[PDB]
């Protein structure tokens, strides 16, 4: 009895202590069980997060009372070497809050459909027994179609059922494919590495039926086009543990603690090993808190600082006191010794295309691809075609390597770098200079648009009898940097204080960074690299990669690393981290995701061009290609709208198209047979005559736009959708907040390749289907919302660029309410589709266009210039001057049986990627035993793909990263090309086979694979380019080396053959609207930056109450104290940010750490929480992407050119956005537009 | 001399990346209930700033901690026993909910149920978790000042800027910020325990964790004022106070606290400290507040000293606890390397959660600078965070121990760089700070590599000692409601018996 | 009337007292987590310092008077003390009480988090205090202490378990009977309300060592 215990008062007194200050008691402590019983739980399950953060952290999911209650990080990753910190615990604040979603008030529990669509669907079905005909009756009626499209984003969702939505979806899909074409059905899902099978689910269903799979790396602007340019690689980087092997690191435009949270300890810990660190950010970012020095260049001007640093490096470590390490490195691993041809201009020369073996008399003994092999001079003045150029990759074998050898004699040669001291004469070559251009918001330095430099040349006798002057990439580079070499060049610097094209004094003016800092760090960085043989590293992120001129920012950093021999050495190099792009078991996952086990090829599309086109953002373009050309280019050869350049790239096979042709591609084969020719020839003939046209020429004719769109693992309309208001108007058909006038309303010049109409087609999408576990902004604007399983309710796998472990997502409990995993949702849609299509679609023949692919023999398309077949400059040759035209047979009724089985092509054709292929029969044999096999039907005898685990085992068994047997076969295939043995890279792990159930027990380190360029090894950490440098495997570029010189015609004419400084572009989005809708408060234009937020990963977790509570409770924008005071804005005041593109509402965070002139609205706070109506649009306030708009860059449209050839997520236009400016002002009326009568007015 | 043991904690602020993961995991486990939704047992504050609750370090306003009277005796700043009782009907110093923040949620369901034909896109507006009413605006939150969120003039009201000419820090080029994660300090001389009239708060003898007994607490809410770190939070619903419990359910079996094991930056170390409980009052009542730090180090005992080992055994400390104390990372950082310092020792509570101060980028200067004593690496005098600010936070204003900690970290860096970049032995910086190569290599092992087994050395709390673990293992957890738990007397009005006990006595002795 | 008389003054006092005591013990043994003062101060500090102090200082003054007055200087001198000192205490009590009730009913955060028992018990205390003050003019009609002698006789009979207690009340003014009935009702409701905090008045604190440590147990 507790009451009776009170009488033991005195007896429970033990000894006093500390001279009477304390008393020890002997009293009951049973109440302590109250907190013990909270901590106790039923079990822990291992799972992870399918969100785009790059973390790839394994967690312990706690189940208590049969419910998910919380999570804590697993700490059992295989430990790293004794001299490296281990990875545990990893984790981050966003991930720690995921459990909140399972039973929260924003969880999607049941399939939902827009009321108006449901009412019409059910009425239609009562008049049309076939659902395809019911869909037709609604969609072909303008008033019915408009009635549910205008209801998008306007409430009215009602609970439906899986059976009802699956029938409608299937019916709409069949209708669309049958009447317009398979490619009028599309799906958007990103970053498969975060949840491989989950991505694969929809991509596989879409690929089987012919739908388009939209890309994401380029669209999100995470693809740094400078990587494909320099290395012929999408992106390959050192793992975070490798930062620990570096002795000098610069974190440049990368907010490590905030955006690489689970890996940040490697950066804080390496400082204790003596490593110096430097933060380069315009604001006092979290990353600065961790570094030894904080440099703050004006945002967008980083390339200027990088050029000046490279200048100091070249001057001091290459010219004045040559570094033996650096000199040998650039000689063997760059295109510097390569010869460039000079073009005659008026009074001077311009750098032209690179010299090819085919240019010389005897073609330097090259009979195979002589026009694709570069040339250099050996140290004995003799011309040679060194091993490794792209020409040696295809049509022959044994010479595609970086052995310093003569491609003809097979003898060892030594390449010469500079011609200085052996030139026949000195010539003057003009270099473009853009440093004097720019808006009023950035400092400029006036020199001349064309800077003449004295270059040492040699005259050569070409094979066509003509004569030509050549110089090396090396000489061209030193001149471009402004390095005086004794020729008394007036445009070269006499010192670092000389304001010349690219000195420390010059950069100080452009960037505001003190020249002595530029010099001191450039020197320390290079000195460190010299002493350690390349252990200097640069960690770079979206701070630099999301600018329109991201390639100049990147090539500036890349050149610094190359000049110091840092790429390819552990502890050194280019460490680019953005999204979770590294899906390690790539060739195991690709066949699954794109149904390549059944049909080849699939229909991949580059999303930036796709949305620029279909959401009609091109109709509002303000940037012209003309204003981007080199001053030395022929302006008349590049006329037209930016979209015209895309259309031209598409018809030349450079970039993919979607929809592809202006006629249903399922109907072409029938017409070809009635005309007595095979489908391919009939298509080529029709294209030439114009009887069949590329759909991109007429995007608004009513048949050339996407009609069905699946969205999953994406919040396209609340996060990544640049040009949000254009998407609402043109794709959705709803109200929108666009403020500006289009080209037509302004009487502007209409495109020359695309039709124009004054009133653009709106509401293009007939059906938008989104799969999610929380009601996101995208769900709010959809027609049908399908509840999906959270990451703690389904099985899947995850990998990342940051570490080498593959681990799983696991179901801690069956999905709650009526939710289903993404795999099961698409499996069920595939099943309903298969039955609904009967009698509408059968065994069909599809004509599919396919762009010329990087890593295929066809990449050797247009070797010396650009020819447009539509202009008659050459014939239309699919696969060379146009896209390949492929025949694909589709068995529509068998879609489900195919979806659920591993197809026969793995056995009939094999598997492969990145230019190599291998036999995978034994893997298919194993899979029959692990997954069991189909008992009957179309896929009888094939392994099964019934569950997500079956799918994961397919990925694990087929990939070289997860199956030692495949790894050795993969390295063997590569060895054929290089003539060097590489199998030793995986022989010691040949018996290794990673299994799904084993990774649930402990994450497993993957196997060294030819798909990548670093090694998974116990003595050296993973570092990109390591195999190129150490195994002598060439980079997949024209020269086989790291490419400093970009000689493609478009690169030359757009002024980017060499790295040059380019100022932020003028989007012209403000001057036309500022002051036009005054609320009485002051307005001011500011640079609008959108770095990634601390309280969410993109928009995921943005609605999570834990994150909203640790943040500021909803959408906010950061302003400098000076700008806020100027505008009369106090901390937390409601503000409105707007331009021609749209408007957004949010609250201010006023801070000293934001420099005057810029505002930061951290990346994606989306449109569902705590947003009042806009005084500009009279609608709900918009989001950060309501003020942005897509503007493509022509150099990113280049294809058919070795390293510049297409690949899903490898090349394509990018969704850059940091150059944007906006008008900012304090709000007056705060109206919520909800009928609550709870509105406010901010005074003054 | 009475030896007791406790698992102390050291947080390395130099490695803190201010991510708050520690805060989210603690919240999910311990304080997601209505009544404590606004309470963050572990919370992280960006400095300069006033923190959570606002201006908690201002003891003139909040009245926390102890004062040393003229006669040399200790008294809670809130008042002696009678003064305290006299304030019981309405604690005049009590922090109000608005000093924390008004907890909120959002009407997410409006996104789901908005009716057909809405004139505008539906949205989820905020609602108070205290009243259930619509909030027109969210004006405060527990981490409102995160990353210098707010005008410098407002953040700089920070108590730690005392005695500092702070204007230069309002200049963009001189900007600095750091993170201060904090939890309960589980003090040796807790002011909370001393200020609770019901005696519901106690320090556990075996592991030093300080708890508020949820049975015995009567909700007098005086302890909240007493605690100078403001780490006790009133549960507005149960009417009782709660606080960080140092994850005792895990510590008891030798596991790290949740915030320790989930610390992403790998900055938290857990290790035993043996202390002389009989010296606590003498140490906490030392005349000069600048001597509290050292007076506390003097109460900590050397676990490898056989005199201490024999006394510990005599005083009941388990063998595995003494052994853990001998490999304690906390003892190494606080006592041997002198890298860890107490948080606000001037409150006189003898706190047991210590901190290694952070390094920072060099300050703004006329030029790019020159090589200093540490070569390309920083010299302590160049760091941009003012050392006086850190001394106000950790050493009662004395910059000497702060400079020694920072200089030693930089010296380790200089030594390691010589080794790993130049391949040479250079102990010059170590000699200057009084460190040996062996000490620098050990510092490096614990701070840099920081293997899991080196960050957490937590022994068992030995729940079997002086108790009956066998019947408990067999019957704990069957919560049917026997009504007999919590009292030593067996008589109970409901005529029941304990489920986890043996009622049939052996008659064979 | 005689039936109700014996019920309220001879029977009801023992029902209320039994419930008061066994209810307190049972709630102490089985409801420790529910045993608290239930401060609402943090949710709204405004006016609490004045209101709670007036209320408590006032009601403790009344308690001391009632305690010694009814369970233990001529009676008429005692009565003057009760009317003047007790009256003053009752006025302080009533002002504090009314302010607390206004706050509990109309301060949004306090009203939103209150239990019905908190409103009920405080309302009854405000009414009882007012009834108490209202008896003063009736006591003034008998300055020789005759009414007080009756009330004290009744109270004393009740606490020593002497039957016939109601007889002592013959002829006392009705106001006193109401006050007595509401007072006993407060004891009946006591164990089912926040009033259990009264049992826990922290007397031991005044002599307790500052630091408390609990041994393994
Ligand atoms: N917590 C969290 N983590 C995530 C994500 C998230 O949403 N939240 N998303 C992923 C993804 S998908 C990406 S693409 C990255 O996180 C982006 O982060 P990063 O630090 O590279 O970019 P960011 O655009 O944020 O810019 C980093 C910082 O650079 C500064 N900055 C901004 N503009 C510039 C500039 O023009 N030049 C220079 N030198 N710096 C600039 C700024 O401090 C910014 O925070 C990554 N993990
Ligand atoms: S959200 Fe990403 S970084 Fe954060 S814990 Fe999850 S996997 Fe790791
Ligand atoms: S020790 Fe445990 S209870 Fe205390 S702050 Fe850390 S997680 Fe929370
Ligand atoms: S988890 Fe660790 S690194 Fe992150 S804020 Fe908390 S203490 Fe600092
Ligand atoms: S003063 Fe004591 S009674 Fe409870 S609310 Fe604080 S532990």
- Chain centroid, CA A523 distance in Å: 33
Which DSSP string do the residues of A830-897 spell out, in sequence order? HHHHHHHTTTT--EEEEEEEEPPBTTSGGG---SSS---GGGTSS---BTTTB-EEEEEEEEGGGHHH
CATH class, range A1047-1237 = mainly beta
Alpha-carbon distance A314 to A538, whole Å?
18
Phi/psi at A825 (nearest 5 deg)? -65, -50
Domain annotation covers residue C61: yes
Exposure pattern of A36-47 as b/e (b: 16+ CB <10 Å)? eeebeeeeebbb
Pick the CATH number of A107-218+585-789+818-897 from 3.40.50.12770, 2.60.120.260, 2.60.40.1220, 3.40.640.10: 3.40.50.12770
- B95: closest CA among B191, B185, B223? B223
- Cα angle B372-B375-B379, degrees, rounded to a multiple of 5: 50
Dist. CA A500–CA A435, nearest whole Å? 11
Q: Has residue C122 been placed in a domain?
A: yes
In terms of DSSP H, where are the helices of B31-171?
A: 59-62, 81-85, 97-100, 109-113, 152-155
Q: How many CB pairs under 8 A join A and B?
A: 380
Chain A neighbors (3+ CB pairs < 8 Å): B, C
Angle at A527 between CA A526 and CA A528, to 5 degrees: 90
Q: Alpha helix locations (H) across B285-350?
A: 292-297, 306-314, 319-325, 329-331
Q: Residue A419's CB: how many other CB atoms inside 10 A?
A: 21
**Centroid of ligand 4 to alpha carbon of A277 (angstroms):** 20
Name residues whose C-beta falls within 8 Å of residue A940's C-beta, 6 or more positions apart in sequence: A933, A934
Nearest residue (CA) to ligand 1, atom 23: A1091
Interface of C with B (CB under 8 A): 25-26, 29-30, 32-33, 35-45, 48-49, 51-53, 55-57, 108-109, 112-113, 197, 200, 202, 204-206, 208, 210-217
Contact A180, A659 (CB under 8 A): yes
User: Using an 8 Å Cβ cutoff, are A123 and A141 in contact?
Assistant: no
Three-class secondary structure assignment of A800-845: CCCCCEEEEEEECCCCCCCCECHHHHHHHHHHHHHHHCCCCCCEEE
In what helix (H) or strand (E) does residue A545 lie, and over which residues does it extend?
Answer: helix A542-545
CB-based contact A1203:A1118 (threshold 8 Å): no
Residue at token pair 């919240």: B27
- B462 C-alpha vs ligand 5 centroid, how far in Å? 28
**Residue C129 covered by a domain:** yes
Min Cα distance B198 → chain C (Å) is 6
Is A790 in contact with A45 (CB distance < 8 Å)? no
Is the separation of the CB atoms in C93 and C64 below 8 Å? Answer: no
Do B239 and B258 lie in a common domain?
A: no
Q: Quick one: closest CA in B to A15, which residue?
A: B2
Neighbours of A264 (CB within 10 A): 27
Planar angle of CA B410, B411, B417, nearest 5 degrees:
90
* Distance from the Cα of residue A1130 to its chain's centroid: 37
**Ligand 2 center to B71 CA (angstroms):** 56
Comparing C-alpha atoms, which of A798, A572, A849, A823 is closest to residue A694? A849
* Final residue belonging to a domain, choices B415, B435, B455: B435
Ligand nearest to the CA of B15: 4
Beta carbons of A357 and A1038 less than 8 angstroms apart: no
Contact C217 A2 (CB under 8 A): no
Helix (H) or strand (E) run with residue A505 in it: helix A504-511
Residue C214 included in any domain: no
Minimum Cα–Cα distance from C32: chain B residue: B215
Residue B196 annotated in ligand binding = yes
User: C172 in a domain, yes or no?
Assistant: yes
- Domain for residue B393, yes or no? yes
Domain ranges, ordered by start, for chain A: 1-106+790-817+898-1022, 107-218+585-789+818-897, 220-584+1023-1046, 1047-1237
Rounded Cα–Cα distance for residues C132 and A680 (Å): 106
Which two three-digit tokens encode residue A1160? Answer: 């930061």
Cα three-residue angle C30-C36-C40, rounded to 5 degrees: 145
Name the residue facing B361 among A97, A293, A1118 (closest C-beta).
A293
Whole-angstrom Cα distance, residue A913 to residue A911?
7
DSSP alpha helix (H) spans, A915-1008: 921-931, 948-958, 964-978, 996-1001
SS3 label, residue A1118: strand
A1110 neighbors B23 (Cβ within 8 angstroms): yes
Nearest to B256 by CA among B21, B19, B457, B41: B457
Q: Is residue B269 part of a domain?
A: yes
Question: Which residues on chain A are in Cβ contact (under 8 Å) with C22?
Answer: none
Known binding-site residues of A equal: 49, 53, 57, 92, 222
The tokens 């950082």 sit on which residue? B333
End-to-end, the C-alpha distance of chain B in Å comes to 39
Half-sphere exposure for A463 (CA within 13 Å, toward CB): 13
Last residue of a domain, one of B197, B226, B244: B244
Beta A376-377 vs A383-384: how paired, if at all?
Answer: antiparallel
CA of B303 to the centre of ligand 1 (A): 47
Closest listed residue to residue A193, CA positions, set A805, A776, A964, A711: A805
Count, residues in chain A: 1244
Which domain CATH number covers B276? Answer: 3.30.70.20
Closest chain A residue by Cα to residue C212: A23
Interface check for A23 against chain B (CB to CB < 8 A): the answer is no
What gap in Å lies between CA A795 and CA A772, rounded to an integer?
A: 16
How far does Cα A208 stand from its chain's mean position? 25
Element (H, E) at A1127: helix A1121-1127
In angstroms, the CA A653 to CA A882 distance is 4
Q: How far is the C-alpha of A40 from the C-alpha of A224, rounded, in Å? A: 48
Same domain, B54 and B203: yes
Is position B483 within any domain?
Answer: no
B476 is in an annotated binding site: no
Cβ A1225 vs Cβ A1136: under 8 Å: yes
**Shared fold status for A107-218+585-789+818-897 and A1047-1237:** no
Domain that holds residue C93: 2-208
Which residues 6+ apart lie within 8 Å of C187 measured at CB?
Answer: C16, C17, C19, C20
Experimental method: X-ray
Domain tally, chain B: 3
A894 lines ligand 2 (CB under 6 A): no
Residue A648: its H or E element: helix A642-651
Pair of tokens at residue B440: 């620098």
Q: Which domain holds residue B140?
A: 17-244
What is residue A574's three-state secondary structure?
strand
Token reading at A225:
């086009």
Contacts of A22 in chain C (CB under 8 A): 209-213
Q: Return the CATH number at B425.
A: 1.10.3650.10
Who's near A525: CB < 8 A, 6+ residues apart? A248, A250, A309, A313, A536, A560, A564
- How far from chain centre, in Å, is Cα A801? 13
In degrees and rounded to multiples of 5, residue B450 shows phi and psi of 50, 55
Domain harbouring C33, CATH code: 1.20.950.20
B395/B459 same-domain check: no
**For residue A902, which of A851, A831, A838, A950 has the smallest C-alpha distance?**
A950
Q: How many CB atoms lie within 10 A of CB A987?
A: 12
Q: How far apart are CA A1194 and CA A1188, in angstroms?
A: 19
CA A24, A29, A34, A38 dihedral sign is: positive
Whose tokens are 């939704």? That residue is B37
Looking at the domain assignment, is residue B480 inside a domain? no
Count, residues in chain B: 509
d(CA B468, CA B466): 7
Among residues A1217, A1225, A1196, A1223, the alpha carbon closest in space to that of A1142 is found at: A1223
Mutate to test the interface with B, among A271, A521, A529 (most CBs of B within 10 A): A271
Question: What secondary structure does DSSP assign to A1198-1232, as a single string?
Answer: --SBTTBSB-TTTSS-----TT-EEEEEE-SEE--
Q: Quote the tokens at residue A36.
A: 């013990």
Chains that touch C (3 or more CB pairs under 8 A): A, B
Task: Note the helical H segments in A262-364.
Answer: 264-270, 286-289, 302-313, 324-333
DSSP string, A229-288: HHHS-S-----GGGGGG-SEEEEES--HHHHSGGGHHHHHHHGGGT-EEEEE-SS--HHH
Q: Which of B435, B459, B492 is the last residue of a domain?
A: B435
> What are the backbone dihedrals phi and psi of residue A15, each rounded to the nearest 5 degrees, phi first?
-70, 150
Tokens 């039957």 label which residue? C163
Residues A1053/A607, Cβ–Cβ less than 8 Å: no
Q: Which of B351, B29, B361, B72 is nearest to B188 (CA)?
A: B351
In a domain, C215, yes or no: no
SS (H, E, C) B369-430: CCCECCECCCCHHHECCCHHHHHHHHCCCCHHHHHHHHHHHHHHHHHHHHHHHHCCCCCHHH
What sign has the CA pseudo-torsion A568, A570, A576, A577?
positive
Measured distance CA(B52)–CA(B78) in Å, rounded: 20
Which residue matches tokens 């108790």? Answer: B467
C-alpha torsion angle, residues A931, A934, A935, A939 (rounded to 10):
-160
Least Cα distance to A599 among A182, A1212, A1207 occurs for A182
* Backbone phi, psi, residue A65, to 5°: 55, 30
SS3 A377: strand
Would residue B492 count as lying in a domain?
Answer: no
Cis link prior to A155 (omega < 30° from 0)? no
Residues B34 and B152 in one domain: yes
Phi then psi for residue A273, to 5 deg, are: -90, 5
Domain total in chain C: 1
The chain B residue lying nearest A781, using CA atoms, is B121
**CB contact (8 A) between residue A96 and residue B420:** no
Token pair in block for residue A1225: 């002002």
- Give buried/exposed letters for A718-753 (b at 16+ CB in 10 A, else e): bbbbbbbbbbbbbbbbbbbbbbbebbeeeeeeebeb
């Amino acid at each position: 009895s507790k009451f009776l215990d009170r009488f033991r008062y005195f007896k429970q007194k033990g000894e006093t202590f500390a001279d009477g200050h304390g008393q020890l008691l002997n009293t009951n402590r049973d109440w302590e069980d109250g907190y013990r019983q909270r901590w106790q739980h039923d079990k822990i399950v291992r799972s992870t997060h399918g969100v785009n953060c790059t973390g790839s952290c394994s967690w312990k999911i706690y189940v208590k009372n049969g419910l998910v209650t919380w999570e804590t990080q697993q700490t059992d990753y295989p430990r790293t070497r004794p001299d490296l910190p281990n990875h545990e615990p990893r984790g981050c604040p966003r991930g720690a809050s995921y459990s909140w979603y399972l039973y929260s008030a924003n969880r999607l529990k049941y399939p939902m459909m827009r009321k108006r669509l449901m009412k019409m669907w059910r009425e239609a079905k009562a008049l049309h027994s076939d659902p395809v005909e019911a869909w037709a009756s609604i969609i072909e009626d303008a008033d019915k179609a408009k009635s549910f499209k205008q209801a998008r984003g306007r409430g009215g969702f009602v609970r439906s059922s899986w059976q009802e939505v699956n029938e409608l979806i299937a019916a709409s899909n069949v209708y669309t494919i049958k009447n317009y074409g398979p490619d009028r059905v599309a799906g958007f899902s990103p970053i498969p590495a975060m949840s491989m099978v989950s991505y694969a689910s929809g991509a596989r269903y879409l690929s089987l039926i012919g739908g388009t799979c939209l890309s994401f790396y380029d669209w999100y602007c995470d693809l740094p086009p400078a990587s494909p340019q320099t290395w012929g690689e999408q992106t390959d980087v050192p793992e975070s543990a490798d930062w620990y092997n570096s002795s000098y690191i610069i974190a440049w435009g990368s907010n490590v603690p905030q955006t690489r949270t689970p890996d940040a300890h490697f950066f804080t810990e390496v400082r204790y090993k003596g490593t110096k660190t430097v933060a380069v950010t315009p604001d006092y970012a979290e990353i600065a808190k961790l570094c030894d020095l904080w440099l703050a260049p004006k945002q967008g001007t980083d390339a200027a600082m990088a050029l000046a640093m490279g200048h100091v490096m070249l001057r001091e470590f290459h010219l004045d006191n040559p570094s033996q390490y650096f000199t040998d490195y650039v000689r063997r691993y760059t295109d510097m010794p390569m010869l460039v041809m000079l073009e005659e201009r008026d009074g001077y020369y311009a750098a032209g295309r690179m010299l090819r073996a085919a240019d010389l008399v005897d073609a330097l003994g090259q009979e195979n691809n002589p026009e694709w092999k570069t040339v250099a001079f050996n140290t004995n003045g003799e011309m040679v075609a060194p091993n490794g150029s792209i020409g040696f990759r295809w049509g022959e074998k044994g010479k595609w390597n970086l052995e310093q050898r003569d491609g003809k004699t097979g003898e060892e040669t030594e390449l010469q770098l500079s011609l200085l001291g052996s030139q026949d004469e000195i010539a003057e070559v003009g270099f473009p200079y853009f440093g004097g251009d720019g808006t009023e918001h950035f400092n400029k330095v006036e020199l001349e648009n064309v800077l003449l430099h004295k270059l040492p040349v040699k005259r050569l006798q070409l094979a066509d009898g003509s004569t030509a002057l050549v110089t090396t990439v090396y000489d061209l580079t030193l001149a471009n940097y402004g390095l005086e070499r004794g020729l008394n060049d007036v445009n070269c610097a006499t010192s670092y204080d000389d304001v010349k094209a690219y000195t420390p004094a010059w950069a100080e003016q452009i960037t505001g960074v003190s020249r002595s800092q530029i010099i001191r760090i450039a020197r320390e960085f290079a000195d460190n690299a010299d002493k350690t043989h390349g252990r200097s590293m640069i960690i770079v992120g979206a701070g630099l990669n999301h600018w329109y001129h991201l390639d100049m920012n990147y090539r500036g950093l890349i050149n610094m690393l190359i000049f110091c021999g840092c790429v390819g050495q552990s502890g050194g190099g280019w460490a680019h981290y953005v999204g979770q792009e590294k899906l390690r078991p790539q060739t195991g996952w690709q066949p699954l995701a794109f149904a390549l086990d059944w049909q080849r090829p699939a229909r991949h599309m580059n999303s930036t061009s796709y949305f620029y086109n279909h959401s009609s953002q091109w109709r509002y373009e303000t940037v012209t290609a003309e204003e981007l050309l080199s001053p030395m280019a022929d302006k008349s050869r590049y006329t037209g709208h930016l979209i015209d350049f895309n259309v031209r790239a598409e018809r030349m096979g450079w970039l993919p198209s979607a929809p592809q042709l202006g006629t249903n591609p399922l109907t072409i084969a029938g017409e070809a047979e009635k005309a007595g020719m095979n489908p391919v020839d009939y298509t080529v003939k029709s294209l030439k005559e114009g009887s069949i046209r590329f759909a991109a020429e007429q995007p608004e004719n009513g048949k050339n736009h996407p009609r069905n769109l699946f969205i999953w693992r994406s919040n396209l309309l609340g996060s990544s959708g640049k040009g949000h208001e254009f998407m609402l108007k043109y794709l959705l058909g709803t109200e929108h907040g666009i403020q500006g006038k289009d080209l037509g309303q302004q009487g502007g010049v209409k495109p020359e390749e695309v039709d124009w109409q004054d009133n653009g087609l709106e509401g293009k999408l007939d059906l938008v289907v989104t799969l999610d576990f929380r009601l996101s902004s995208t769900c709010l604007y959809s027609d049908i919302i399908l509840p999906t399983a959270t990451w703690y309710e389904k099985d899947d796998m995850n990998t990342s660029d940051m570490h080498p472990f593959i681990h799983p997502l696991s179901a801690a409990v069956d999905p709650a309410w009526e939710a289903k995993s993404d795999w099961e949702i698409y499996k069920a849609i595939a099943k309903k589709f298969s039955e609904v299509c009967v009698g509408h679609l059968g065994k069909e023949t599809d004509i599919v266009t396919l762009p010329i692919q990087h890593d295929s023999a066809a990449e050797l398309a247009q070797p010396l210039d650009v020819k447009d077949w539509k202009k008659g400059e050459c014939d239309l040759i699919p696969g060379k001057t146009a896209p390949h035209i492929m025949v694909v047979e589709r068995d529509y009724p068998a879609t489900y049986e195919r979806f659920t089985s591993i197809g026969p092509l793995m056995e009939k054709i094999g598997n492969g990627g990145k230019g190599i292929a291998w036999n995978t029969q034994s893997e298919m044999d194993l899979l029959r035993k692990l997954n069991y096999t189909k008992a009957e039907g179309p896929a009888k005898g094939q392994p099964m793909l019934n569950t997500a685990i079956d799918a994961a085992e397919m990925i694990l068994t087929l990939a070289p990263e997860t199956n030692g047997q495949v790894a050795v076969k993969a390295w063997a295939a590569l060895s054929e090309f290089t003539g060097r043995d590489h199998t030793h890279l995986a022989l010691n792990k040949e018996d290794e086979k990673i299994r799904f159930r084993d990774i649930q027990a402990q994450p497993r380190k993957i196997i060294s694979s030819p798909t990548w360029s670093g090694l998974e090894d116990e003595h050296v950490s993973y570092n990109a380019g390591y195999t190129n440098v150490h195994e002598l495997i060439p980079w997949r570029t024209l020269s086989g080396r790291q490419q400093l010189y970009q000689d493609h015609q478009w690169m030359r004419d757009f002024g980017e053959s060499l790295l040059v400084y380019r100022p932020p572009i003028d989007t012209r989005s403000v001057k036309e609207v500022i002051g036009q809708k005054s609320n009485g408060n002051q307005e001011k234009a500011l640079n609008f930056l959108t770095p990634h937020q601390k309280w969410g990963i993109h928009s995921t977790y943005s609605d999570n109450l834990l994150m909203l509570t640790l943040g500021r409770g909803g959408p906010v924008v950061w302003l400098s104290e000076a700008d806020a005071k100027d505008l009369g804005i106090a901390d937390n005041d409601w503000i409105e940010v707007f331009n021609s593109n749209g408007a957004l509402t949010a609250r201010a965070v006023v801070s000293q750490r934001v420099p005057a002139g810029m505002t930061m609205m951290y990346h994606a706070q989306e449109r569902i929480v705590n947003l009042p109506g806009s005084e500009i649009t009279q609608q709900r306030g918009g989001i950060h992407n309501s003020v942005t708009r897509i503007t493509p860059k022509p150099t990113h449209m280049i294809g058919g050119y070795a390293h510049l050839a297409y690949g899903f997520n490898y090349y394509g236009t990018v969704g850059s956005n940091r150059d944007e400016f906006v008008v900012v002002r304090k709000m007056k009326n705060i109206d919520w537009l909800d009928g609550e009568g709870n509105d406010q007015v901010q005074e003054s | 001399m009475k030896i007791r043991s406790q698992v102390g904690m050291v947080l390395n602020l130099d490695k803190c990346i201010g991510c708050h993961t520690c805060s989210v995991t603690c919240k999910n486990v311990w304080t997601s209930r209505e009544g404590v939704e606004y309470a963050w047992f572990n919370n992280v504050e960006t400095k300069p700033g006033q923190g959570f609750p606002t201006d908690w370090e201002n003891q003139e306003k909040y009245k926390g901690g102890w004062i040393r009277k003229i006669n040399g005796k200790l008294q809670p700043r809130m008042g002696n026993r009678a003064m305290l009782l006299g304030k019981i009907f309405a604690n005049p110093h009590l922090p109000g909910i608005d000093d924390y923040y008004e907890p909120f949620d959002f009407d997410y369901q409006n996104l789901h149920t908005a009716p057909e034909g809405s004139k505008s896109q539906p949205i989820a507006r905020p609602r108070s978790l205290i009243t259930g009413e619509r909030m027109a605006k969210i004006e405060k939150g527990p981490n409102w000042e995160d990353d210098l969120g707010g005008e410098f003039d407002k953040l700089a009201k920070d108590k730690n800027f005392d005695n500092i000419q702070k204007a230069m820090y309002s200049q963009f080029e001189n900007t600095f910020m750091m993170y201060l994660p904090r939890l309960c300090e589980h003090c040796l001389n807790p002011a909370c325990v001393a200020t609770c009239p019901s005696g519901a708060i106690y320090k556990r003898e075996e592991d030093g964790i300080v708890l508020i007994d949820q049975d015995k607490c009567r909700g007098w809410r005086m302890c909240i004022t007493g605690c100078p770190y403001k780490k006790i939070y009133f549960n507005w619903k149960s009417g009782k106070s709660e606080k960080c419990i140092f994850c005792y359910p895990r510590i008891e079996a030798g596991q790290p606290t949740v915030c320790s094991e989930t610390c992403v930056g790998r900055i938290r170390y857990l290790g035993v400290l043996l202390y002389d409980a009989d010296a606590i009052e003498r140490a906490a009542s030392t005349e000069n507040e600048k001597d509290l730090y050292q007076r506390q180090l003097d109460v900590f005992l050397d676990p490898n000293d056989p005199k201490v080992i024999e006394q510990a055994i005599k005083d009941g400390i388990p063998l595995s606890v003494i052994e853990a104390a001998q490999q304690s990372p906390v003892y190494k950082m606080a006592m041997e390397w002198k890298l860890a310092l107490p948080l606000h020792p001037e409150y006189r509570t003898l706190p047991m959660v210590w901190y290694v101060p952070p390094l920072s980028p060099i300050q703004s200067a006329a030029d790019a600078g020159e090589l200093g004593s540490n070569g390309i690496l920083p010299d302590v005098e160049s760091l941009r965070i003012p050392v006086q600010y850190l001394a106000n936070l950790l050493t009662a204003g004395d910059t000497k121990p702060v400079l020694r900690a920072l200089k030693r970290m930089l010296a380790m860096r200089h030594y390691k760089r010589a080794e790993t970049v130049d391949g040479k032995v250079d102990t010059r910086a170590l000699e200057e700070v009084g460190l040996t190569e062996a000490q620098a290599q050990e510092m490096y092992r614990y701070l840099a590599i920081a293997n899991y087994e080196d960050r957490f050395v937590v022994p068992s709390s030995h729940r079997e000692l002086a108790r009956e673990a066998f019947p408990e293992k067999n019957g704990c957890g069957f919560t049917f409601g026997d009504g007999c738990h919590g009292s030593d007397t067996k008589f109970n009005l409901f005529n029941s018996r304990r489920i986890d006990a043996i009622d049939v006595t052996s008659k064979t002795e | 009337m005689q039936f109700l008389n014996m019920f309220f003054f001879d029977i009801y006092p023992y029902i209320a007292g039994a419930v008061f005591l066994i209810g307190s013990w049972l709630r102490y043994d089985y409801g420790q987590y529910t045993w608290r003062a239930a401060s609402s101060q943090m949710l709204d500090r405004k006016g609490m310092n004045l209101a709670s102090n007036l209320f408590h200082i006032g009601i403790l003054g009344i308690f001391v008077g009632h305690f010694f007055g009814m369970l233990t200087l001529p009676i008429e001198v005692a009565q003057k003390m009760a009317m003047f000192a007790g009256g003053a205490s009752g006025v302080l009590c009533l002002i504090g009480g009314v302010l607390l009730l206004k706050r509990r009913l109309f301060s949004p955060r306090v009203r939103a988090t209150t239990t019905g028992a908190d409103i009920l018990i405080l309302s009854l205390l405000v009414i009882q205090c007012a009834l108490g003050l209202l008896t003063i003019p009736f006591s003034a009609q008998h300055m020789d202490g005759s009414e007080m002698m009756k009330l004290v006789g009744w109270a004393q009979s009740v606490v020593t378990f002497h039957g016939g207690a109601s007889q002592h009340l013959d002829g006392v003014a009705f106001i006193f009977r109401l006050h007595l009935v509401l007072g006993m009702t407060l004891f009946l409701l006591f164990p089912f309300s926040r009033l259990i905090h009264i049992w826990s008045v922290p007397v031991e604190y005044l002599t307790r060592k500052y630091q408390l440590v609990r041994a393994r147990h």
